[PDB]
Amino acid sequence: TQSKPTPVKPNYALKFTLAGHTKAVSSVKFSPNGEWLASSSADKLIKIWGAYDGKFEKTISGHKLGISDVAWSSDSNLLVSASDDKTLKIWDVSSGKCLKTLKGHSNYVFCCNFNPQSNLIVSGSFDESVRIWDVKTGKCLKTLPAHSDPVSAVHFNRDGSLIVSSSYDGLCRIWDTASGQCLKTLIDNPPVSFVKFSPNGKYILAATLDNTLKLWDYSKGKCLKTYTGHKNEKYCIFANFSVTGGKWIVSGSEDNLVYIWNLQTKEIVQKLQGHTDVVISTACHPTENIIASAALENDKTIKLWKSDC
Numbered sequence: 001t002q003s004k005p006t007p008v009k010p011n012y013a014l015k016f017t018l019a020g021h022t023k024a025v026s027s028v029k030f031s032p033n034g035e036w037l038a039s040s041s042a043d044k045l046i047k048i049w050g051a052y053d054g055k056f057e058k059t060i061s062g063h064k065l066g067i068s069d070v071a072w073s074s075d076s077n078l079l080v081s082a083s084d085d086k087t088l089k090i091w092d093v094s095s096g097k098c099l100k101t102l103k104g105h106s107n108y109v110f111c112c113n114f115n116p117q118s119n120l121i122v123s124g125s126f127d128e129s130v131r132i133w134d135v136k137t138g139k140c141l142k143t144l145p146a147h148s149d150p151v152s153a154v155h156f157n158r159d160g161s162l163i164v165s166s167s168y169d170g171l172c173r174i175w176d177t178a179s180g181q182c183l184k185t186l187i188d189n190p191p192v193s194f195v196k197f198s199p200n201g202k203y204i205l206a207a208t209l210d211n212t213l214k215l216w217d218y219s220k221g222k223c224l225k226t227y228t229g230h231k232n233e234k235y236c237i238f239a240n241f242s243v244t245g246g247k248w249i250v251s252g253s254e255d256n257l258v259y260i261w262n263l264q265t266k267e268i269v270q271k272l273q274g275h276t277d278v279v280i281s282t283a284c285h286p287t288e289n290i291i292a293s294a295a296l297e298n299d300k301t302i303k304l305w306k307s308d309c
């Protein structure tokens, strides 16, 4: 009498629009505890918003130029941001203040993430390097000469033992965190604009600037699934796994829509309309069927969408 729900499609609908940034939004992320959404922007600001109701909570300031990415610690108490001012900053969310400024990159910092233990941060920069930083001291532990063009994404796996990086040089590389040495290079060679590890730890989801998302088994070098129909030839647009309800892949797009695909069949199951510029970033809530999306400078808003499945 116990049955398994299996949705053909979700029904995400617009619930709230979050206004307040004054330039393009660059990233949105839900806190691990589900309570908050953080956004970053070219306007040099981080904003915090209620994850369930969209209500503005606070602004966090101090970078001297625009910000490309922001990421939460596992306990939801810290943020790290990556800026054009060549630094990362670690923030105490409660106080709103900067704890540490991570100095060492020689050009814009584009991407960042804590490891799950949250004692480390990983960054990637226009300077073509990946850096690994100690949270407690705020100092650089390792500099990896990772790529030969800007680094577009960095992500740790679930125990922090591996980092995956992507670059406009066309490569995805897997690094051993403890030693900094490369375990594998995945290779046409179109620019890779986003990558992250999959929920089961075995795959990487990679976006390339040829309008294509691919799910790769990184150990076998085999592409398992491919998702198309969206537009992505210019911007580094995040992609997500939606793990709370039906199994979906989510991404923004240069045609101003959020795209959602069936993980297994690869068919588009919904397109979310409402933004008025490129949707550069999307995020999926960790426990509820909620999506956040954010757009470039003609729009400058974040939208929260909710589904029943």
Ligand SMILES: COc1ccc(Br)cc1S(=O)(=O)Nc1cc(Cl)ccc1O
Binding pocket: 198, 199, 200, 201, 202, 203, 215, 224, 225, 241, 242, 243, 247, 248, 249, 263, 264
């Ligand atoms: C547990 O893993 C999840 C869970 C949710 C999602 Br959305 C993706 C993954 S996965 O990408 O890591 N594994 C996977 C891949 C395919 Cl192609 C088919 C079925 C799968 O469970």
